[PDB]
Design a protein around this ligand. Structure first.
Ligand SMILES: CCCC1C(=O)N2C(N(C)C)=Nc3ccc(C)cc3N2C1=O
Ligand SMILES: CCCC1C(=O)N2C(N(C)C)=Nc3ccc(C)cc3N2C1=O
Ligand SMILES: CCCCCCCCCCCCCC(=O)O
Ligand SMILES: CCCCCCCCCCCCCC(=O)O
Ligand SMILES: CCCCCCCCCCCCCC(=O)O
Ligand SMILES: CCCCCCCCCCCCCC(=O)O
Ligand SMILES: CCCCCCCCCCCCCC(=O)O
Length: 582
């Protein structure tokens, strides 16, 4: 109505409002201490209540951006702490706001957040729950300036549930830690995806984004009309554009609008939206974004009717290429919730290439008549990888599967650093343990989603520390040829064995007191190193060596006077192994 703040306050509720204002300020004033942020929040909340009480009270008519900017420009240390940014206060809206986004550091030099001992966490939680959770929101928000504030709040609440549930438990640690580790993972995954989507829109452009969207939305809402999907793809692209620019308000209003639109037209979009559409304003978007795929229409024609057999294919195509290709994708995707999005893009691209040639050929219909046959090998490549890799994972376990990946990628890109190879391999191993659990129907989408982030993170590191032209080739390839380009990597013939280093292969009894995760990482680091030294070793030779090693440990650890055993037997092992691998 007349007062924007009061409106949001009433819509949101005091609790969420305060949470959001806190996240907002922390995302910009990433450097100010916690105590300072709490004060601003109180002041803004006070102001808010004033406007709710009397919508005509002073300033209550000012816009959110203006109000937000004015308070921001209140920090006296502004110039001394952010310098350049303070200059923004001299500008006027909307340049002031714009000037602020331009100075929001996407990655500050803040210290890593250390997880305290479970007992101190629980105690702090019980003694001052309110500030325990706000501190949490503060620390996270300031480290992820672009994380969509509301998603952040969603994470906060699960964070609180974990403490409520686990601090009462008989065995707090066994209950809390795992929930915390999972939260961190999901949080980092979610954050990495948001950045990934924004980066994509930048490099690859809008068209490619809309394409990605048509496909994903079609698998989700297979009953919706193409017209509806187009409309959505359009608004969703605007949303991400604004959300990527960093402006929280616009981002939020766009998402709110999209969600209501969807909920009002839900009976013609998807049946699986009842649940999501009842939830509170703050959770609609979140819910809808993760809503389960709907059941697909029962009486659905063969694509080849409208896209191969038809006589007016080139006519309909020439008439509006993108649109036609859009309908193709839409048709292909809603019949395949089991394909990864990028696979659907590959087919679409293939179809496009074909139409581009064939529509300028003698008899078009004869040129593009067998195009669908060109899809089969494209669809099959990713399918067999899943099958082959998931079976291997069912046999060996996550850990031994991770060891297999280690041997496999170290041989492919020996140049990469050992610690990097270890991390990426463990993560890939995780993708296997979380996706192979599902039935074929959902394996590909699962892998696609996790692999996209793992691969991008891979590219980022490497981008900073280049080591191989091949990796950079794949990393700068189309985000549709990316995974395939990495799958096509072959053993490196050139790589010359690393000079033997005795130190690298000597172990002390400390490895026994080490924690599993610690032990594994130590063993795996030796593994990569072994492979870098003897890149021609075969699975059998390696297998054999690892076995001896297995014993070696179990033998030394769990045996009177361990230190000695690791220096005596260790000498033997290392010597024998070298001869074995000549
Ligand atoms: C190095 C990562 C440490 C780290 C961590 O444990 N976090 C956490 N906790 C405490 C559950 N929750 C998060 C949720 C989302 C994001 C984006 C980040 C975190 N957060 C971290 O940054
Ligand atoms: C893969 C899920 C398809 C998908 C979907 O339904 N989305 C949606 N709505 C409300 C349509 N809003 C978004 C808001 C935030 C994020 C991060 C993602 C989406 N968006 C999607 O990407
Ligand atoms: C700060 C303004 C927050 C407005 C609420 C946004 C919720 C929209 C949504 O994601 O569904
Ligand atoms: C709303 C209609 C837009 C859909 C456009 C269809 C484009 C499909 C081609 C695949 C795009 C991948 C980009 C590329 O690598 O060339
Ligand atoms: C380990 C599990 C990895 C699954 C195999 C990779 C399949 C990739 C599907 C994504 C794509 O279509 O490129
Ligand atoms: C550095 C190691 C490269 C990792 C490649 C991950 C791509 C996953 C596809 C699986 C495969 O085909 O090998
Ligand atoms: C030279 C000898 C080097 C031996 C180091 C190989 C470590 C491989 C770890 C085996 C895996 C395991 O035991 O779980």
């Amino acid at each position: 109505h007349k007062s924007e703040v009061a409106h949001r306050f009433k819509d949101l509720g005091e609790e969420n409002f305060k949470a959001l204002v806190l996240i907002a300020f922390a995302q910009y004033l990433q450097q100010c201490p916690f105590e300072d942020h709490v004060k601003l929040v109180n002041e803004v909340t006070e102001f808010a209540k004033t406007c709710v009480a009397d919508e005509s009270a002073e300033n209550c008519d000012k816009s959110l951006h203006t109000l937000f900017g004015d308070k921001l420009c209140t920090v006296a240390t502004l110039r001394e702490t952010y310098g350049e940014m303070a200059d923004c206060c001299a500008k006027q809206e909307p340049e002031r706001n714009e000037c602020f986004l331009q100075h929001k550091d996407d990655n500050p030099n803040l210290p890593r957040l250390v997880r305290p001992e479970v007992d101190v966490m629980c105690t702090a939680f019980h003694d001052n729950e309110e500030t325990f959770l706000k501190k949490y929101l503060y620390e996270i928000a300031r480290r992820h300036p672009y994380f969509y504030a509301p998603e952040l709040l969603f994470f906060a609440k699960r964070y609180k549930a974990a403490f409520t549930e686990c601090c009462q438990a008989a065995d707090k640690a066994a209950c809390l830690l795992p929930k915390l580790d999972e939260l961190r993972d999901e949080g980092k995954a979610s954050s990495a995806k948001q950045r990934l989507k924004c980066a994509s829109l930048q490099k690859f452009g809008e068209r490619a984004f809309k394409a990605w969207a048509v496909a994903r939305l079609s698998q989700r809402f297979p009953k919706a009309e193409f017209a509806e999907v187009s409309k959505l793809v359009t608004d969703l692209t605007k949303v991400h554009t604004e959300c990527c620019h960093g402006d929280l308000l616009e981002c939020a209003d766009d998402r709110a609008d999209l969600a209501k639109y969807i909920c009002e037209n839900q009976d013609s979009i998807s049946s699986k939206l009842k649940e999501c559409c009842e939830k509170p304003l703050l959770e609609k978007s979140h819910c809808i974004a993760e809503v389960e795929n709907d059941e697909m229409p029962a009486d659905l024609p063969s694509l080849a009717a409208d896209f191969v057999e038809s006589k007016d294919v080139c006519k309909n195509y020439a008439e509006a290429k993108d649109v036609f290709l859009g309908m193709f994708l839409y048709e292909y995707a809603r019949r395949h919730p089991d394909y990864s999005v990028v696979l659907l893009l590959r087919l679409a691209k293939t179809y496009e290439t074909t139409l581009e040639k064939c529509c300028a050929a003698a008899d078009p219909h004869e040129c593009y008549a067998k195009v669908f046959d060109e899809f089969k090998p494209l669809v099959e490549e990713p399918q067999n990888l899943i099958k082959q890799n998931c079976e291997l994972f069912e046999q060996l376990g996550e850990y031994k599967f991770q060891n297999a990946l280690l041997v496999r990628y170290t041989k492919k890109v020996p140049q990469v650093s050992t610690p990097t190879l270890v991390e990426v391999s463990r993560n890939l191993g995780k993708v296997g343990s979380k996706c192979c659990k599902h039935p074929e129907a959902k394996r590909m989408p699962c892998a696609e989603d996790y692999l996209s982030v793992v691969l991008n993170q891979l590219c980022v590191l490497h981008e900073k520390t280049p080591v191989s032209d091949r990796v950079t080739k794949c990393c700068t390839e189309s985000l549709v040829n990316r995974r395939p380009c990495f799958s096509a990597l072959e053993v490196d013939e050139t790589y010359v064995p690393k000079e033997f280093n005795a130190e690298t292969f000597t172990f002390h009894a400390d490895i026994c007191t080490l924690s599993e995760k610690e032990e594994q990482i130590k063993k795996q680091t030796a593994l990569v190193e072994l492979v870098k030294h003897k890149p021609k070793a075969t699975k059998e030779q390696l297998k054999a060596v690892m076995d001896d090693f297995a014993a070696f440990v179990e033998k030394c650890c769990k045996a009177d006077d361990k230190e000695t055993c690791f220096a005596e037997e260790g000498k033997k092992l290392v010597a024998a192994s070298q001869a074995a691998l000549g």
